[PDB]
Amino acid sequence: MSMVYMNIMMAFTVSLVGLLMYRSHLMSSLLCLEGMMLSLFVMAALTILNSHFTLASMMPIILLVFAACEAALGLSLLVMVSNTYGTDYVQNLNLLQC
Template sequence: MSMTYINILLAFTVSLMGLLMYRSHMMSSLLCLEGMMLSLFVLMSMMILTTHMTLASMVPIILLVFAACEAALGLSLLVMVSNTYGVDYVQNLNLLQC
């Protein structure tokens, strides 16, 4: 495995650990999710280029579309929660809490 793949997998792992460690604030969770999606996009693009799989060349573009939709929904949820409660804590999203 080349050093480039190891660096991309390390970026994914660091983003995943950041998501697990800093999950109390919504903005940091969204940034970690975006880091994970970016590293997945680069990894998939590199794998398709090295294996010359022309049939799977649309998969990274589809991943980017889903990442953009996830970012838009996450930011709209962040704006809604911060306008309602004044903070961006994830614990404010619990509907069972009074």
């Protein structure tokens, strides 16, 4: 494939590994989730623009809109977690262990 696709897919893989390899902050993991969205938006836009798929030109916008709404829900969960424990550390979310 084209050379640009090498790096866009690499960016998605890098953010996916970042997402699956948590540290402590929940916000850091939410940023990786947005990173995957941004790489998906670029890969979709490049494919659609280069192929001149005219009606598909709106699809990246719909992706952006829906994923931003997803991120707003994710942020709201983060603040509720932070209100409970005083931080957004994932290690605090282990009650359902038992």
